[PDB]
Design an enzyme around this catalytic site. Sequence first.
Site, mmCIF file in Angstrom:
data_model
loop_
_atom_site.group_PDB
_atom_site.id
_atom_site.type_symbol
_atom_site.label_atom_id
_atom_site.label_comp_id
_atom_site.label_asym_id
_atom_site.label_seq_id
_atom_site.Cartn_x
_atom_site.Cartn_y
_atom_site.Cartn_z
ATOM 1 N N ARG A 151 -14.445 11.998 -0.850
ATOM 2 C CA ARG A 151 -13.143 12.667 -0.816
ATOM 3 C C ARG A 151 -13.158 14.073 -1.425
ATOM 4 O O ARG A 151 -12.347 14.924 -1.051
ATOM 5 C CB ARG A 151 -12.096 11.807 -1.532
ATOM 6 C CG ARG A 151 -11.230 10.995 -0.587
ATOM 7 C CD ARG A 151 -9.847 11.644 -0.422
ATOM 8 N NE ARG A 151 -8.813 10.745 0.102
ATOM 9 C CZ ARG A 151 -8.500 9.543 -0.397
ATOM 10 N NH1 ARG A 151 -9.140 9.024 -1.447
ATOM 11 N NH2 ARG A 151 -7.527 8.836 0.173
ATOM 12 N N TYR A 194 -8.921 -0.348 2.658
ATOM 13 C CA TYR A 194 -8.290 -0.246 1.337
ATOM 14 C C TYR A 194 -7.888 -1.593 0.714
ATOM 15 O O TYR A 194 -7.505 -1.647 -0.456
ATOM 16 C CB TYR A 194 -7.081 0.692 1.412
ATOM 17 C CG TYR A 194 -7.454 2.069 1.914
ATOM 18 C CD1 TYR A 194 -8.191 2.942 1.115
ATOM 19 C CD2 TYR A 194 -7.097 2.489 3.195
ATOM 20 C CE1 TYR A 194 -8.549 4.202 1.570
ATOM 21 C CE2 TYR A 194 -7.451 3.750 3.660
ATOM 22 C CZ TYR A 194 -8.177 4.602 2.841
ATOM 23 O OH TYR A 194 -8.529 5.851 3.291
ATOM 24 N N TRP A 242 1.972 6.828 10.366
ATOM 25 C CA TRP A 242 3.069 7.646 9.849
ATOM 26 C C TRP A 242 3.927 8.226 10.986
ATOM 27 O O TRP A 242 3.441 8.431 12.107
ATOM 28 C CB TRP A 242 2.507 8.776 8.970
ATOM 29 C CG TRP A 242 3.544 9.795 8.611
ATOM 30 C CD1 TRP A 242 3.667 11.052 9.123
ATOM 31 C CD2 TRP A 242 4.621 9.626 7.689
ATOM 32 N NE1 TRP A 242 4.756 11.682 8.574
ATOM 33 C CE2 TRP A 242 5.357 10.826 7.682
ATOM 34 C CE3 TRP A 242 5.023 8.583 6.845
ATOM 35 C CZ2 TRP A 242 6.476 11.008 6.867
ATOM 36 C CZ3 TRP A 242 6.147 8.763 6.045
ATOM 37 C CH2 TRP A 242 6.864 9.962 6.073
ATOM 38 N N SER A 277 -0.027 7.955 0.254
ATOM 39 C CA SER A 277 0.410 9.216 -0.382
ATOM 40 C C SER A 277 1.676 9.143 -1.262
ATOM 41 O O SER A 277 1.965 10.093 -2.008
ATOM 42 C CB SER A 277 0.532 10.350 0.656
ATOM 43 O OG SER A 277 1.542 10.082 1.629
ATOM 44 N N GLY A 281 1.936 7.177 3.986
ATOM 45 C CA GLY A 281 1.407 6.848 5.301
ATOM 46 C C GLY A 281 2.096 5.768 6.104
ATOM 47 O O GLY A 281 2.553 6.039 7.217
ATOM 48 N N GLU A 327 1.588 1.455 10.189
ATOM 49 C CA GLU A 327 0.945 2.697 10.606
ATOM 50 C C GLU A 327 1.108 2.863 12.117
ATOM 51 O O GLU A 327 1.288 1.875 12.834
ATOM 52 C CB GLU A 327 -0.546 2.644 10.241
ATOM 53 C CG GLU A 327 -0.810 2.710 8.729
ATOM 54 C CD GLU A 327 -1.016 4.128 8.228
ATOM 55 O OE1 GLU A 327 -0.884 4.363 7.013
ATOM 56 O OE2 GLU A 327 -1.329 5.014 9.056
ATOM 57 N N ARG A 380 0.843 -1.180 0.000
ATOM 58 C CA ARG A 380 0.000 0.000 0.000
ATOM 59 C C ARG A 380 0.889 1.245 0.000
ATOM 60 O O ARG A 380 1.662 1.461 0.931
ATOM 61 C CB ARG A 380 -0.901 -0.004 1.234
ATOM 62 C CG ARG A 380 -1.771 1.250 1.328
ATOM 63 C CD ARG A 380 -2.806 1.147 2.419
ATOM 64 N NE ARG A 380 -3.389 2.468 2.685
ATOM 65 C CZ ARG A 380 -3.086 3.261 3.713
ATOM 66 N NH1 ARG A 380 -2.213 2.900 4.652
ATOM 67 N NH2 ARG A 380 -3.691 4.433 3.818
ATOM 68 N N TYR A 433 -1.515 20.908 2.894
ATOM 69 C CA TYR A 433 -1.552 19.526 2.424
ATOM 70 C C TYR A 433 -3.011 19.102 2.212
ATOM 71 O O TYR A 433 -3.833 19.159 3.142
ATOM 72 C CB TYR A 433 -0.852 18.620 3.443
ATOM 73 C CG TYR A 433 -0.575 17.211 2.974
ATOM 74 C CD1 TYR A 433 0.100 16.969 1.781
ATOM 75 C CD2 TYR A 433 -0.974 16.119 3.727
ATOM 76 C CE1 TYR A 433 0.370 15.661 1.355
ATOM 77 C CE2 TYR A 433 -0.716 14.809 3.298
ATOM 78 C CZ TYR A 433 -0.043 14.593 2.114
ATOM 79 O OH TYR A 433 0.214 13.303 1.693
#
Length: 416
Positions: A177, A262, A394, A88, A370, A392, A85, A192
């Site tokens: 989104r 995801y 980040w 970003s 991330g 995770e 994954r 951002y």
Amino acid sequence: HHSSGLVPRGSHMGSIIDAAAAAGPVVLMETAFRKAVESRQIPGAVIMARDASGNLNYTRCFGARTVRRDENNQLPPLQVDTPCRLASATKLLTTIMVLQCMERGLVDLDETVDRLLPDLSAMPVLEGFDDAGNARLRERRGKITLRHLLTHTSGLSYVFLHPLLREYMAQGYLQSRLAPPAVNDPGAEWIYGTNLDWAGKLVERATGLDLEQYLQENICAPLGITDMTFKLQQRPDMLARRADQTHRNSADGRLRYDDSVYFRADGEECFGGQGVFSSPGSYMKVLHSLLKRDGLLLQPQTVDLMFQPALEPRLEEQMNQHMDASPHINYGGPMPMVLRRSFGLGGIIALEDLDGENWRRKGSLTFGGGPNIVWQIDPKAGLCTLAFFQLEPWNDPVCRDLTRTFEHAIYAQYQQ
């Protein structure tokens, strides 16, 4: 003395120890990675470094792609070809796709978005809330351009990073989104945001292809990549080999399986901001091409554009103030907390050497994903590097410190 017919070698303890040269920076660093896996501090990592000449082609994989035991009760390895994954780290890819559109005359970087993105242009800006608690929306001042999207200066923000948008959601306005309003006018500040989701839509509308097809034809095919997609659910071979996400629990610091959305639902749209799954190997092929100026993705002059400071002094100052004041967000990952930066097209630019001649140089471009993914391209040093984790949240201290150690070691031995 020496044994007849046998290679002369260490024959006692002093001569054996001296026959082995001492451990350089890279060997010591690999030991730190192995110990972090051994002691259960990280699930695993893939680290990669390349130069332009081909004399540096360094890939090391440590540990597991999951904390869930497989059908044989083992923890399968994180590999250079493991689908990961990107989150970003997708943004660099979408930036490249936009720049290809520009190269082919489909768009101009300074054109307003109104033509291809009238749904974006129609969006208001959230100024605040009145005494009653009602949203105060107004018309945008000035036009958003493609270059604003690429440099995160459009006025768009992610919901969770802005207090106005957090309260906007808290009062039930967002029940998507692309739905939330902008929080400033274009050119006003570096913020951002969802800019590359919008830029991805622009690519789809400019070309008449969905982002997946555009990606395959214009980034994957030219580099011989077959492990990079927005549509992981439609690739059963990738699906079965994929990394699971791991989360570090903030209380005990233990690693747990992270069952997040995801990996089960592709979602129908391709999201240019966070949607790509890629192996470390395939991502490095992108970085390396850009380092080489080999013209496979973009003309050399266009790549050079990506590394040029895009911000005028006011925005440069504001961005640096924001970033220096926000180590809890830490866009720059392993970079020093205080550093003079700008933003280019596709990432943050270092405007000064990180540590003189020991590490990344002025003009280097970088960003992250991330789950503690960090990439950087350093034209002056002649190096590009990536550190891929699937952990995770980040800005995990263990991952950040390991990533620093990796880069420091590679620069110490191989920077030219």
